[PDB]
Amino acid sequence: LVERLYLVCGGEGERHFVHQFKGECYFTNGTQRIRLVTRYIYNREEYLRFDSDVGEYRAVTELGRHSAEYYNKQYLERTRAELDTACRHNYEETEVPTSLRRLEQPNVAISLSRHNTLVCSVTDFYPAKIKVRWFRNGQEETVGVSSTQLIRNGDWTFQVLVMLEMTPHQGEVYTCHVEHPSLKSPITVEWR
Amino acid sequence: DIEADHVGFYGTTVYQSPGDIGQYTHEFDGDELFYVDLDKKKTVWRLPEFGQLILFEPQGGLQNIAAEKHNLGILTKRSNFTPATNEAPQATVFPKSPVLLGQPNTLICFVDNIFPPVINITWLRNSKSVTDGVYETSFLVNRDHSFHKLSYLTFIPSDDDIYDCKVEHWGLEEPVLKHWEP
């Protein structure tokens, strides 16, 4: 049992009032250049925000002018430190052995929707990175392709529906061809 | 604004009053790692899979909660008890896998543009109310510091079943009905 560490929120000196703390680690290229950002919010106004690239706490609206000075004194140590002790340690010890190591296998299926329309229905994947083409007889069809946005079902999956507008002659070879990278080999589905 | 491969929202307290409402949740690229339930004082992992390997000590949601109360204290005065402006949630209903008779699926109700973090999200089957096999998320942050929230329905498609997703939220005059049919 390796422990997950929280970023610390720092204290102070029929109508509803609302306060948010958003601590946020920005990774790029491994842990090669981490960026720490803490923001403090009244209702929706962001009033005071530490950001590692600036390196101190700053006000963001007039409502945080007094807040700035105080935090810079009582935290700021420990807050510069957080990047190196729970932006990093979080990533290099709990993200590596979990999220950065989820693959979830996709899930391709075709069907006639209503000259009709064919719906390639690519479900259940993770990561979000995915490619989905329409081959009617061996070559790729550009026109009559209308995809959705990349739905996010928020259980750590995805889905996307690619749509081909067509008209069935004879019996023809239709192909939803699908590249993820939980797939070493491209799923390719056949239709009538 | 703001280039990166991965985003860890680690520590995300939210407190709103009156009524004492709080919510401590971590995220990774947009999906709920876990929330701390505040009565019982226990981490609650989104996919219990994540519960076997790593632990989060829950008292640390409590700490971030405590300071988040305090600064509400201070700020609410400071702003001249400017109170928050009630937003209209939007709903879209969709299904996880394509729809096929007799095979079980999941109905999804996703609500975005929530503010405040109080909403009511419920399910209708031919307009009689449903609770069994419902799961609902945490509040999930956005950019403009709203929230979005989704609830899930266990069904088994059929005919003619008619499915409504219903939203109650103070920003709405009258409950919104989200209507869906296979």
Partner: T-cell receptor, first 109, second 111 residues
Framework: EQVEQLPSILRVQEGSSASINCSYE??????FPWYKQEPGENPKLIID?????ERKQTQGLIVLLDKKAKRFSLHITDTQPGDSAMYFC???????????????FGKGT | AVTQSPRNKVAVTGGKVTLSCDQT?????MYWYRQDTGHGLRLIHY???????EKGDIPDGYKASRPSQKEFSLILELATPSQTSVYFC???????????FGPGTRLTVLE
């Protein structure tokens, strides 16, 4: 198991340097600081360090950490009687936490 | 700041003792330490909030209570000569780091 202080009792000539060792479990801990209980008084904080670095030196006060050794320690220059206090060594999982949330405190000097 | 009444009590074996604290820092977590020469700075009980009280290092004969943010009270149900020591209070929180200790409390039991 947790933290051992040392030295237990210590003398020093008025004008010499003075040093307190420490070690931990704990495992890595990210908060290790110091406390000066004045004769017949409360403990008040003097200096701290996290695993972020290994050397802090602040207004006549010298603190060192070796993380991998599970080892840190405290030094002063050109002493007086004014720095004759019961000094207190503690260490803790910076936060989050926890069981080993905060402090601890070794036996004392 | 912190304070604490009593600042010195003298007790009677088989009595009830109560030492209050009352921090005013709006702080989250409070702790009762006992400082005895030889044995250091030992932790009796503590808390993370108004309501709950957790066992510390040396909670034998020490039943501890905390009714609110401000107040944290150490209770010695039944006195004995060995309960005799100094006693300290300290608060910290929202959100640290730095334990703020109380002025002190010198107790004495007798047979």
């Amino acid at each position: 198991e947790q933290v051992e202080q040392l030295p237990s009792i210590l003398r020093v000539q008025e004008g010499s340097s003075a040093s307190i060792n420490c070690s931990y479990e704990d495992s890595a801990s990210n908060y290790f600081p110091w406390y000066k209980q004045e004769p017949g008084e409360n403990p008040k904080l003097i200096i701290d360090i996290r695993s972020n670095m290994e050397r802090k030196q602040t207004q006549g006060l010298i603190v060192l950490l070796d993380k991998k050794a599970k080892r840190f320690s405290l030094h002063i220059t050109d002493t007086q009687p004014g720095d004759s206090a019961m000094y207190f060594c503690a260490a803790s999982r910076r936060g989050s936490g926890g069981s080993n949330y905060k402090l601890t405190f070794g036996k004392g000097t | 700041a912190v304070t604490q009444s009593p600042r010195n009590k003298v007790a009677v074996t088989g009595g009830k003792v109560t030492l209050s604290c009352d921090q005013t820092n709006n702080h989250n977590n409070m702790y009762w330490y006992r400082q005895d020469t030889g044995h250091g700075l030992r932790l009796i009980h503590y808390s993370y909030g108004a309501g709950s009280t957790e066992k510390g290092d040396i909670p034998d004969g020490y039943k501890a209570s905390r009714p609110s943010q401000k107040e944290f009270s150490l209770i010695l149900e039944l006195a004995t000569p060995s309960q005799t020591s100094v006693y300290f209070c300290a608060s910290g929180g929202l959100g640290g780091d730095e334990q703020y200790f109380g002025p002190g409390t010198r107790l004495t039991v007798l047979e």
